[model samples]
Target: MAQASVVANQLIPINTYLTLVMMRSEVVTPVGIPAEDIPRLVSMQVNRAVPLGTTLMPDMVKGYAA
Candidate 1:
């Protein structure tokens, strides 16, 4: 992985040594949204195949998502 441009963010004190590899925080109030380009909001997901007669229902599907 390319060396991280910015070091540990001072705001986050928890796990100072253990850099947060999974999460992050940024200020949007001062950092105004750009009109030119921006990412469409989307959440992470794991796609998987279901058995022959899998029922696509909440809390019904197996271990993970469809």
Candidate 2:
């Protein structure tokens, strides 16, 4: 399980969410989701209504934005 740096259902502006989620890597496990895909995930909206620090899944993230 993993969580984006930003809260659920919130507008994720560039550079903001990336640092917030990636800043602390101590607790996150590097198993699922590609290392490069994180940026895209943070850019788009969330599929679930998770709370702060909730675990995130691969499917939760939508397609990449152009």
Candidate 3:
């Protein structure tokens, strides 16, 4: 058996984090729509996946340096 867990830490403001969750949930609304309607519908997913506010600037490596 496999187990899964979700861990949230405060790297940013709490309100900003929750807002991301809300916006991500809205991305799922288009999956059941008809095929012909998919292009616009699926754009929601694309937009959310690469939203402006939810991005990492310079990739940082945080670890024990050897």
Candidate 4:
């Protein structure tokens, strides 16, 4: 019984940690791109030679006018 309780407690924290990691990877980090240039980043993701992951999106290009 004691072992089962310990396992249950461990599972909740592990699941919560994994959830936060996924949220950070998918949203918080990507949304850091400036609101103005997000369209360009999305366009580049579709058309440029750059690779397709969030990490490949450019940072310095964030604030430019279209």
On lDDT, the leading prediction is: 2
- Worst lDDT run of 10 residues, candidate 1, spans 33-42
The reply for model 4, stretches above 4 Å from the true place, is: 1-25, 28-31, 40-49, 56-66
Q: Mind giving the per-residue lDDT tens digits that candidate 4 earns over 1-66?
A: 111100011122211211212211222333333333333433221222222233323332223234
Residue-by-residue lDDT tens digits, candidate 3, 1-66: 122111111243322322233222112221322223322322122211233233221111122111
The global C-alpha lDDT for each of the candidates, from Candidate 1 onward, is: 0.24, 0.41, 0.24, 0.25
Q: Candidates' TM-scores?
A: 0.16, 0.39, 0.18, 0.20
Residues 1-66 of candidate 1 have per-residue lDDT tens digits of 222121112332322222233222333332222212112111222133323222222222123232
Ranking of predictions according to lDDT: 2, 4, 1, 3
For model 2, residues 1-66, the per-residue Cα lDDT tens digits are: 553232223333332333335322223543434444445665454454445444344555555343
* Model 2 lDDT, residue 63, Cα: 57
Local error of candidate 3 at 33, Å?
0.8
Q: What is the lDDT of residue 3 in candidate 2?
A: 34
Q: lDDT for model 1, please.
A: 0.24
By TM-score, is 2 or 3 better? 2
Off by over 4 Å in 1: 1-46, 58-66
RMSD per candidate (Å) reads 17.7, 7.1, 15.9, 16.9
lDDT of 3 at 17: 22
N/CA/C clash count, model 1 = 0
